Amino acid sequence: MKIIVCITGASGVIYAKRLLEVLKDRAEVNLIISNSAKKIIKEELDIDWKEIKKLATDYYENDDFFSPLASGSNKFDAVVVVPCSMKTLSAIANGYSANLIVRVCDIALKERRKLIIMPREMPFNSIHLENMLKLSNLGAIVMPPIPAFYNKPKNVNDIINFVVGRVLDILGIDNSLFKRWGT
Amino acid sequence: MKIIVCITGASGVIYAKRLLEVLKDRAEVNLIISNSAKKIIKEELDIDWKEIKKLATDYYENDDFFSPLASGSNKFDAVVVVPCSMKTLSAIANGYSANLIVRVCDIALKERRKLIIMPREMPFNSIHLENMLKLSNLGAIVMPPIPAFYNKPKNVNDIINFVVGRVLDILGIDNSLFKRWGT
Amino acid sequence: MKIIVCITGASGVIYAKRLLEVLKDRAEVNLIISNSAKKIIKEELDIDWKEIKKLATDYYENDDFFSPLASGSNKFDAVVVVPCSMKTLSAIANGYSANLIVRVCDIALKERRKLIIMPREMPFNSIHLENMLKLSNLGAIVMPPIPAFYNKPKNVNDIINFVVGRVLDILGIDNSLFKRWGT
Amino acid sequence: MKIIVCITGASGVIYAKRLLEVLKDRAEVNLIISNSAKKIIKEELDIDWKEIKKLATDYYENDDFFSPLASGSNKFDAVVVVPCSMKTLSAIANGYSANLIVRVCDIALKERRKLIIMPREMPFNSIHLENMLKLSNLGAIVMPPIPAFYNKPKNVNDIINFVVGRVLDILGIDNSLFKRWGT
Amino acid sequence: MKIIVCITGASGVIYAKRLLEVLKDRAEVNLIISNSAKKIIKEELDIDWKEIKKLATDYYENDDFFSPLASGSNKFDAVVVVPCSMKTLSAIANGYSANLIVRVCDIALKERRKLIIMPREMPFNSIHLENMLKLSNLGAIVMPPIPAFYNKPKNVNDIINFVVGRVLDILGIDNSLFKRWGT
Amino acid sequence: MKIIVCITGASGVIYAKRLLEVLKDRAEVNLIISNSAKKIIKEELDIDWKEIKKLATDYYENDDFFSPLASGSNKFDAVVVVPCSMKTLSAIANGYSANLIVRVCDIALKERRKLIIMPREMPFNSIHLENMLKLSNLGAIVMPPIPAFYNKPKNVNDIINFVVGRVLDILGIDNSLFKRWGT
Amino acid sequence: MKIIVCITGASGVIYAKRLLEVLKDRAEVNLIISNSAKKIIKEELDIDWKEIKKLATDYYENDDFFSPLASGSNKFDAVVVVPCSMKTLSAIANGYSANLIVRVCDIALKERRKLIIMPREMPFNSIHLENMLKLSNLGAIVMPPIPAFYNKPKNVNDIINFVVGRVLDILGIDNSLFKRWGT
Amino acid sequence: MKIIVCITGASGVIYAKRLLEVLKDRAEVNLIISNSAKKIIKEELDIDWKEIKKLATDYYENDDFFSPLASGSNKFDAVVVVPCSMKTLSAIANGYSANLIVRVCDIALKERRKLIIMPREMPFNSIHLENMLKLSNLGAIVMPPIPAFYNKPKNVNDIINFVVGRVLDILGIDNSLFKRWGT
Amino acid sequence: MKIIVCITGASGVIYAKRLLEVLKDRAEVNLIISNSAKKIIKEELDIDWKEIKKLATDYYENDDFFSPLASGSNKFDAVVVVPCSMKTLSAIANGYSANLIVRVCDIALKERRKLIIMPREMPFNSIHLENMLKLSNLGAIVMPPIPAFYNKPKNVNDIINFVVGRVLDILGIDNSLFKRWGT
Ligand SMILES: Cc1cc2nc3c(=O)[nH]c(=O)nc-3n(C[C@H](O)[C@H](O)[C@H](O)COP(=O)(O)O)c2cc1C
Ligand SMILES: Cc1cc2nc3c(=O)[nH]c(=O)nc-3n(C[C@H](O)[C@H](O)[C@H](O)COP(=O)(O)O)c2cc1C
Ligand SMILES: Cc1cc2nc3c(=O)[nH]c(=O)nc-3n(C[C@H](O)[C@H](O)[C@H](O)COP(=O)(O)O)c2cc1C
Ligand SMILES: Cc1cc2nc3c(=O)[nH]c(=O)nc-3n(C[C@H](O)[C@H](O)[C@H](O)COP(=O)(O)O)c2cc1C
Ligand SMILES: Cc1cc2nc3c(=O)[nH]c(=O)nc-3n(C[C@H](O)[C@H](O)[C@H](O)COP(=O)(O)O)c2cc1C
Ligand SMILES: Cc1cc2nc3c(=O)[nH]c(=O)nc-3n(C[C@H](O)[C@H](O)[C@H](O)COP(=O)(O)O)c2cc1C
Ligand SMILES: Cc1cc2nc3c(=O)[nH]c(=O)nc-3n(C[C@H](O)[C@H](O)[C@H](O)COP(=O)(O)O)c2cc1C
């Protein structure tokens, strides 16, 4: 399974870090990190962004349009935008593929490949909601990171693993990352 | 400030508990708890629902339409639906005021009083998103509990206090519940 | 009163200069100037852009996302985009917060803070008009600089002071910058 | 070139006066002045409205439906509504041809003749914007008088000549009324 | 508090009379009465319309566009159209400010001032309902005079005072004009 | 059968004259003639408008809102607007009942009585077509006078009788005014 | 000027006959006649359809897709569908180019050439009106044959010449076929 | 894999010929050729249409509704309409299953089977674009034959093989028909 | 004839090269090449981008907003975006004039000058199709490079000359670049 993981400049890049490590030995992972996300990884995770780069089977710069990912002639199974900034949510919904992340999302939509986006914002305004609705109407899986608590998390890590486990659920990847509802 | 806190049957009732206690001595709080939320409080917080009832200046049953809240002739400043189930999100968006919670939301909209809803679901489908968009277009503040991490939470409690602090921000209530972006 | 003044690359930056000086001692003013507007200030006002920078209580670069303004956790009262380019009008209407100006407009909309935009173009096409209509429908005050003449302006300065006085009117700031209709 | 100039009751009738005199010897000009505009000409230009009447090759009263203009069987090249009141903008957008001005605009639309409207209002509300969008979508040129300043106006007259020069530009009439962008 | 009371030609002008007298010493009231409403006041209240004129701090004729109210440069707090004819409901919804009443409603919408309309008709058709929906979507308070009976009215006067008390409620004016729901 | 015949200022008032005389002894006919139609009757039929007035069982001035027709409490079976000007088509579609004709059309729609309109214009623009579509969607019978020729008309009179016969067909009135398709 | 005249199966083919003869020596006319129109020409004009065929510079069968007209690579100035059946109005509006007539209309729309349609039906339903509105919105000239009477027609021929003269007006062809409004 | 290949009357039937031969020994292919496409195969490929018929595992006439394909009770995996005429694009988008091709497309949509359409036209008008948008919104893969050149085609054959290879890509059929982007 | 040729980063820049050379001595050509297109010219045409620069009467950098083209006060006859990337298609449709190419397209739309766009993508998704539909609805000529084969191309060059000949057709430029349908 070939999964494109796209990190954009919004709070909660810890979700992307955890997803990348639970995917390490279970899927071919291509990684793209926007310039804004590089600064957020540094600020929120107190590690340099290149530390995230090594958890993927391949990495491409967000401005490297000569990447093989930038064409529908090349194939992949799924895209995960985690977290998804409001800027990138807008670009995906309107087709403004000015970087590699939005280009591979636009490719996923035209080639009918699975597209998961995790918009992180609070509150949402009507522009965010309409951009999400449009993409959901086109078959994208709109999945803002909204933890539940029926698994009774004991720490931050339990919350992160719930969100990531649900992402793997949507990807069709079996996991036991969280205590499910039936316990 | 008179605030109506409405707890519906969705995961994350811990947000409602924390909001009620930080509001205890700062606002007149009226509380409504749906039957489904009573079971979720018991399951997720391992306390009986009547323990939540005592944190409010007033309580009304979700089926008590003779409550003073059930009429626009009586006044309040804000409604907070936390967490907001998809069922109640649907009812508010379509005006199906079959219980007291949806009735006071419908009152808030016709009387132009502040309405905050916190829909808790993951992923969202297009029905959820359109119901949220409609309500946001009418002036409701659509605020799913989506924690950020730039405050670097050290525990579950730091995550809950971020979400609740943002709710107080929207209510216009000064608080220091979380480390803000400028630190 | 904390007002964010955003200057974008469209003709009529003299409006922004006049607004900044009548606001100098009456409000806490944060200023953002886009790169395009820096060139227009130089071309139309024959002064370097840093001369405008000093009229504000604070300045932030349009690419400084680490500015405190870039988060809803921090507070302000109003945003004024003067003048508003068609590019920035598009970005605000579609949520493409790729710079600090659009990000604080998007924040204003989600946090329900006052947003004033002054699109400067002639003629308008249907894309401009639909972008303005959408934002007006969301509660933004869409205010292209369209001077009136019932005050009988004697010079360019009287025209600029009419437009700026109307902006202060919308902000709720008492002023006598122009001869009102009742004279 | 036969141009219908329609003056309605909104501020800025000086634009109509200047347009009429630069058109004097370059086009066959038919003029209509609404009753409200007659009062505004008097108040803003301190001249009687009949002084404007003499600058046209023909004049018709706004209630003279027996005018030849009131039928599509008769021909013209363009209509200019300057300035355009919000009332007349509404009437044109909804087809309420209760006077000669709106009737010749409705004729222009059905006969596919050029229609220019210059709505003068500040701010615009959503009703104005939707009425303009509808007309722009039908091929009308929606042109609120929004002066630019890259020509560095030295006086009110330079501002008026910029707006009027742009109107002549849209009409296809060569002019040197303003210093263009390339200088 | 400066309130514009606008009486249009629909049945139920008794509501406007009662509102004007309960507002007499509690707000600065400007009054406009349409020609049709003058005849309805005479027919339904068996008093000459000038008897209503004296209950206001100021009066303006519906055709007096030189009134200070006819410009956004002048300020007011709220407009109440009571009762609102279907003709005037249409004009407000479509922006056809052909008289002073609709002009001050259009001003209220562009200046974001409170607008209350009380359309009186039975039944409503789809044109009425869409005109009301549009205005409600723009933030107007659409308030047809629909008395309730939980206050157990003993006479016509109790019904009129309920409707008027609710109008004062929306205006933010404290009153005891009716027995509220909580009794 | 009580039929309201409304003549508005558009070409083809001969249709209204012929309809009124074929209805003379077969239905109770109430007649309203707009001021514009009075001039068109004079110009196109070379007879004074009062000659048309005598063919009806009752006549009311277009500004006589005290007419019994102006209330839904009074009853009628059908309204025929023949011919229908574009101005009146607009007013009916938008609910702008500023005269008795549009008021009785609006009454017909709310009371669910039969409404026939015969818009006379050529070509139609998109505003006309949308106004007709809206009214047709509400159940009005939109019937521009478009003669057919399968009856092989020998003179103008045969064309007028075809159009009028079709109107009687829609009214449910048996007639032999034209040679039907089956001959 | 190269004009495509398309006759479809609706009443009023006399309009097409008259248009073809007034165009004989003033434009290059290509003619297409549908099978249904061939029967209507015979029934309504009591002449064989081949009599109409000779009035054109070229004729093509409605099923001859190898005609040069059937490609946008070949050029023409205008299409006139007279009369336009409801079936063909539907096909044009929905793009169902199953014959040569609809194909050249679809070509006219993609190549931005003038398209005139004359739908003949009475009354219209909402399907007709929406099909006309869509085409008018795309720039087609929607022109049902609706004669006026201000020219005071003395016979059927005067009515036919009014309609045809208006068609030539829209085509930009000078004519004196009817007494215009200014007489 | 059972694939229905449908050839309609538009230029570029060479794409259908090439697709049929690369599919010969890799899938069960059912073929339908419209009458118009039979003429285009003859004109553009200078071979009789029956030469194309032999490349399929089964053939059915476009009017043979007794074909097993004409019912959803029978199964297939994918439909490819190559090339897709504007007429057939319209019929599919509107559900006008008047032949076997459109019927199996309508079946594919109701049974949720893969539907690929390749509309061939240049330019497109708004009717084409809306018909494509509607079908794309329903899950059809809208794929006009638009060759790329990053594979550096050396001849017409390289262009045809790129388009066909992309079709096989969408079908999930591995192929090396073109030099992919990563070379 | 002044034509703006805009090359954006999509496959098929050979179309732009061929169009520029057939336009060399027949029109005043202004050229803009985006940074992405510069790389694609190098990769697909194996020539440096400056080789394309010399075929135009003028060249401007895509970031040179001080170019005379960047203002509506300066005039041109037509814009051709060939090829049009999905990113630039999005920007034009939404008005995001962040570079000179989109700015001159936005100018073309407001000044009602001819705009031709040639989006190159396969397949299209619903975002592409809606962006094209919107622009086509505004009067842009949406012309993806979709070659036909009725001219029986013998080589790649014949395909390129068909597409370019059709572009000249839309521009109103006589050419014999391809064998037309009538041969
Ligand atoms: C510390 C920080 C946190 C941010 N958090 C968010 C966020 O949570 N949601 C959001 O939409 N934007 C957020 N932003 C702003 C975005 O980073 C900004 O819009 C940026 O342009 C996104 O670009 P990208 O999608 O290419 O990463 C944040 C910015 C900073 C500096
Ligand atoms: C343990 C549990 C957790 C649930 N969590 C959610 C949830 O997170 N979001 C949601 O929409 N519904 C959730 N539901 C289902 C809702 O409770 C259900 O739709 C209910 O009818 C809501 O009614 P109420 O809004 O009146 O409380 C949950 C149900 C259970 C038993
Ligand atoms: C001298 C000059 C004047 C301009 N005037 C306008 C204008 O009046 N309206 C507009 O929409 N764009 C105008 N532009 C183009 C914008 O500056 C351009 O779209 C830019 O990208 C806007 O970016 P910004 O909003 O970040 O400032 C002008 C450009 C120049 C060089
Ligand atoms: C002094 C004065 C200035 C006005 N200015 C405007 C204006 O700038 N914009 C506007 O929409 N209406 C304005 N109005 C109100 C309009 O004149 C009013 O709506 C009138 O009915 C327009 O009618 P008309 O379009 O037939 O001229 C103004 C009125 C007055 C008395
Ligand atoms: C006695 C009487 C009662 C009326 N009642 C109503 C009414 O209740 N609702 C309504 O929409 N129109 C009613 N009308 C008709 C309106 O007065 C008419 O449409 C008028 O043009 C409204 O104009 P205005 O809004 O400027 O007052 C009534 C008319 C009369 C004579
Ligand atoms: C001689 C003459 C003929 C007219 N013919 C038409 C017409 O055929 N269609 C139309 O919409 N307006 C026509 N008009 C204009 C209308 O009369 C005008 O819009 C008027 O305001 C209609 O008002 P009413 O509907 O109250 O009669 C004509 C005007 C004149 C003077
Ligand atoms: C005598 C006769 C008259 C007709 N008149 C009309 C008409 O006036 N309007 C219409 O829409 N259809 C009319 N029809 C039906 C159309 O001819 C029918 O829908 C036909 O399929 C149109 O096909 P065409 O557009 O290819 O000519 C008439 C049919 C007949 C036999």
Ligand SMILES: Cc1cc2nc3c(=O)[nH]c(=O)nc-3n(C[C@H](O)[C@H](O)[C@H](O)COP(=O)(O)O)c2cc1C
């Ligand atoms: C030589 C020729 C080429 C054609 N090319 C096209 C084309 O490229 N696109 C199109 O929409 N129609 C084209 N047509 C017209 C269609 O064949 C026509 O609309 C036909 O009815 C389609 O029917 P079908 O889809 O059942 O094959 C062409 C016609 C001919 C004769």
Ligand SMILES: Cc1cc2nc3c(=O)[nH]c(=O)nc-3n(C[C@H](O)[C@H](O)[C@H](O)COP(=O)(O)O)c2cc1C
């Ligand atoms: C080799 C190559 C080929 C590309 N082909 C296309 C294409 O055919 N269609 C498309 O939409 N984008 C294509 N792209 C991606 C665009 O270049 C990218 O979205 C870019 O940002 C467009 O920017 P521009 O419009 O300013 O040139 C291609 C990229 C590369 C590297």
